[PDB]
């Protein structure tokens, strides 16, 4: 028997080990294969009540390669190093967010 | 202008139109019909159509002061079921004019009112229903639907996770809330009331609501994720249901639960309209469904009740886990899950979709897999239902050896590993045990859960295939 | 204080108490159970009891922070059904503490919630229910009951007479009211809405209510007898049902009708409380009953729904005519008619009364014989149901050759002759045709009715005996 | 006391008083009248006055049981329009006694009720209206007005900035709120609903309200400026409009929007009174105005509808941008903007002010410039409307290459540079491009905006000059 | 998934579908349209459809986070009026998804909202409206009607 | 494409470059030419919800020269150096504030 510790979570893919940039690359590849538009959002906090983070640039509508999204993610990391950064995938057929995982915690 | 002929006559003369093609505004019903020996099948189907729309046993002179052909239900097709001496699928078309707009109750009262007890009939099952777009437009539908719900709870990219607090009945309100807190802080998105928990001497509903709300606030503060608990507002009366819903709103609860069959469709539609009017999500429990939908030869198939619940209103609905302790076939469940979640579902007899159903942008309903499942079923469920679903582990979370919170964490880790492997491009139906095994190598709570329930598996004959 | 054993275990260990005697405050349920081959019957019954009261598939540690034995449902008896390889009657006893006071919905959700879809079960039927006096006291029961209804409508010494206006759907509100007037002025105590007539494009409910009220006033003024019309207030929502009921009250209507199954028990109890609060009689239509109660091996027998409707509230309830177009056996119908009307009904397996039921002065419910009957069935019905019943001739009145009013008069004359001959000391079951024949010799409307329907008779195999 | 002469007679005998001088309490109407060939102009104007106040086609004897001269509308002047063979401006004076106090609906029904379809008339336009001070006093006017609005939103010294979220219809509630947040955090004071966005299957109004309120709170927290979003409460019924307004109040929203023409003046006055009673600002969208006010020869000029909207109630009103994608002449727009914002506006035929209008301290209405404008139009708009106006860039903000927030910032920088240069003593109409160019040299968002829309310009023939 | 092109473009590219046949659930509008001299009639009708359903003057990037083709109003026919140099009847089809159920106000605000004041338009008349049965069902209609009255 | 930074704003004339005292002088000159009464307000915070700042002395009703308003502004700066200081212009014909710009941030 072991007591579950008290950790703050960050929605989907937060109860998994620290996300290697390879697994992040696979997640962005997956949302590209499904036709989801990737976007990079950032915020100073990760409160669950917060509906909106701040959009970094514009969603990668013309994107076709995971390296481009990774470049936006690292650009956000360089500009905001004390911000939670997450990668979202917009499905536009049903107009609903279809992927959302955090890629960066405040440094 | 015909004369009046007093006396009984065959139903088939005026109610069996095999040449009639269905109008696009008609309601279409598929009936699995088993007549008595020596009863003509077409006469049996004509009796079904007549007694479901306008027919009486004998001729009435008031039929003449009307245009009967514009209201009569017509059986436009009868085809024998394979491998059946006396079982036929009859397709009956009803004019849109027969049904009260926005009333699921009236639709069911017209369709399944008294034809199931016809003496000339041995068994009757309502398999499927084509709801025309014009009729669909008269309903509110789900108060929110899948996408609005996901936006409101800020949860994307995975199935949601829930649990029913066990034991069903017996726990005090405070201990109930403590169990809710321990489950929620472990990683479950939702907890829920057992469908029997309404307001009992051991647990008054107001105390349960208060303690559950406190546990939700505590676990939300801890984990930093939106936590919820389906509060059963099912009550004896509509006033009591509304009071419970209003108190759930007062406690800033995001979701309430209702039993749409034991509670009824009138109260369900009332609660769905209230939920839309007050921004409350509506989880729908299908208690007593198996009384109606268990047998192949008689009753109403759950896809009909699912369409009716979608129109009457519900954000979640239980659909059966396929692989759990309760009965539901894979193909039919896939069929009515697509019926509940999709906007357009094409005709497919192989999945029980007897009619092409178009929802005209009526929002879809979340699928709820609940009953006798643990982490080992997690890959298959992620394979079956996908993201737009809720996976409910009552005994699979509280039954974990370490407690509610470690069991919740074990389920969350199994779910997240399955989602990750699915996204990466793995075959979940093939390597589900592989994914679970690596996650157990990483997760001790998951390891204990899997070693506890490794040889637990519900398989029996499928009575409804 | 036992330890916590995580893992699944047999239900029979903690849920099959064959030595337990039922407490007088327990709810007793008789289940016709057909398990899967190779599933022990006692394990199947224990699963039924556990999943209907507190049991989960695996052990939960929250069971220990409770007194389980005071809430667990127990199967205290299993006896094989005669002539059945795998069908047994299981008697399950539930503590009074499990159920919400005054809630039929909660009772059914606990009992018939999800056990009917257990994978280890092939078929399940809820045959009978023992409602303890202590539980009965928490319900309102019928808003008025038989004797208060008879006092209010000033009708004594005979069964009441009614009719459904035909066709079911299609008639305009004004023509509907005209048919109501013609039926009522001929001698019928009541007319009624078809269970499908709620509010349709061809007939808005408010216009129907207005015209029906006018016809009632005209026929009451003419005949000098209390006339009534069951106004269907069944609606999509509880607010709409309440608006229709309030308008029926405003028009000084004495009785309203509701479908307690398609409408639901929540709305039914709401309407019954409203009816008690506003002096309105409540006719109860059992639409969709045959979906649940038609098969012998699966579902809920109508006597259970009848007890639940008596507690939830209803002055009238449909019971089946035995000899009409809809299925119901003689013995079982006698059983649940006694259950609905009497205060004390002793145990009788031969009539389907598995438990002795005491109603503790809960008023009885009027029995309604409706569906495929004419004057020829009149003696038998007077023999079967007696005075405290309503005999409904939809097609047997409007289908008369001369019109609604002569058909109503023919039925009234047949009924009054049968009552007179019964009072005088004649054998109605023997000389029913004799009484009808002499009345026809005196009544021309009756003569035409009898010559029209002489060879009309519904007989088939009894699926529910 | 004259006798009664049954029969038709000319309108000019009793309705054309060319010597009559208008009382100061009279309502004065200027009509651009084009009669049929061979119809005397004075007879045509007399018909207009008679059918707009009291006249019927023939003489009625009930005219004698009255003092007709105290209610009759009189045409006290007719002057030919320059360059018109058959077009005349007729000035008609109506007694104050004819109109219901505080009712714009009644005023319009009296004035523009049925005279526009007179057979003897070819075309009729209501150009201007003199509302007497005594009539003005019976209205609430704007719920707040310009100065109270500026005090409430704590915004002084510049025009306000807004944007309509694009696309008009199609966006989900959550994405809509995200666009609102991005626009608001960039520097826009306001965002707004498209006039078509009320409550649609893709976007329920309650979800939109919730998400918009959250975006407003986030952007207010970020920028530290009062942020707002015009929430369209236009609905099918007044109850639904009131529910939407009440929810907007519950979410602590400062402003709501209404379509006063498609919604109607009854609902508009209801909402304006509600807005005054609950401290809510009222943005007024003029959807369907161009159906009435586009042609020079027929309809109602927008200045009449603007006076009526000022009296019925509105804090903002759309006035046309002059230089955008929608039609409105410079001089007439200046005229009705002064009519909407000023307390005293003197007679000026050159600007379409046919009457001197005194508002008796009725607060002014903010002018809204919306439709097909970008940063290049910014100086001219600041020149045209001044500070007490709202400049709305729907496509000029979301259509910026970098996104909503950079486009909002580009518009804010252009506006602030224009205001600064105006305050310093620069000629905005002359050096507007100069100011924009220096700001672009300083602002990259502005540079991208200007290089995107440099050659975008809507110029056509002015149909309404 | 297309990229984002900031800048104005012709309405006719995405709002004039002359091959499109009307769905039975669409709202159909007949417009008597008189454009300015030198304005293409089809461009004028496309502007009517765009500004009546979803179109803005320039391209917005939020169009991409949507399925535009399921909401856009389409002009599926333009036929010249007899004896008219510059007057055409344009038939525009609107998806049922655009309109609030049971709201005549919303229907008119969508249809006749601001297209009648388009600068490229000289005159516009809404001649007729096809209300689909599915939309008709969402309204109460007359409180009673002729026969009940 | 460039992501907009998160900056706190201070209403009118805040989205322009740092205000030179010459441009401030021109703004006060403008409000003197229009007949607006200038006043100097100060506050510890610049929350948008705050309707009222604290008035410094009294509005310069008798003012006719921009130097006098500049003298009040610098006096407020000297007395309150950790306060937001803004210059308001009261139009008394319509009785509404007509000019409002910040002249000092907490230093
Ligand atoms: O109690 C449970 C599951 O709890 P557990 O995890 O202990 O099995 C649910 O109420 C029903 O069983 C779901 O099944 P259905 O789809 O029939 O409602
Ligand atoms: O329509 C009728 C009878 O009309 P008719 O006289 O034409 O047969 C009743 O609604 C049900 O049939 C009664 O049966 P049940 O007991 O099943 O409700
Ligand atoms: O949609 C808009 C402007 O958006 P955009 O910035 O894309 O042009 C407005 O609703 C009307 O067009 C304003 O004009 P009017 O004064 O006729 O209401
Ligand atoms: Mg349960
Ligand atoms: Mg009936
Ligand atoms: Mg608009």
Numbering used by the authors:
A (entry chain I), F (entry chain L): 1 to 107
B (entry chain B), C (entry chain A), D (entry chain H): 11 to 475
E (entry chain G): 11 to 159
The authors write:
The sample was initially imaged and screened using a 200 kV Glacios cryo-transmission electron microscope and subsequently was used for high-resolution data collection on a 300 kV Titan Krios transmission electron microscope. Processing of the latter dataset revealed two types of particles: asymmetric classes that derived from the cylindrical FaRLiP-AP core complex and classes with strong bilateral symmetry, which derived from form I Rubisco. The derived structure is very similar to numerous other cyanobacterial Rubisco structures.
Far-red light photoacclimation, or FaRLiP, is a facultative response exhibited by some cyanobacteria that allows them to absorb and utilize lower energy light (700–800 nm) than the wavelengths typically used for oxygenic photosynthesis (400–700 nm). To address these issues, we have isolated a FRL-absorbing PBP complex from cells of the marine cyanobacterium Synechococcus 7335 grown in FRL and solved its structure to a global resolution of 2.78 Å by single-particle, cryo-EM. The fraction containing the FaRLiP-AP core complexes also contained ribulose 1,5-bisphosphate carboxylase oxygenase (Rubisco), and the structure of this enzyme was solved to a global resolution of 2.35 Å.
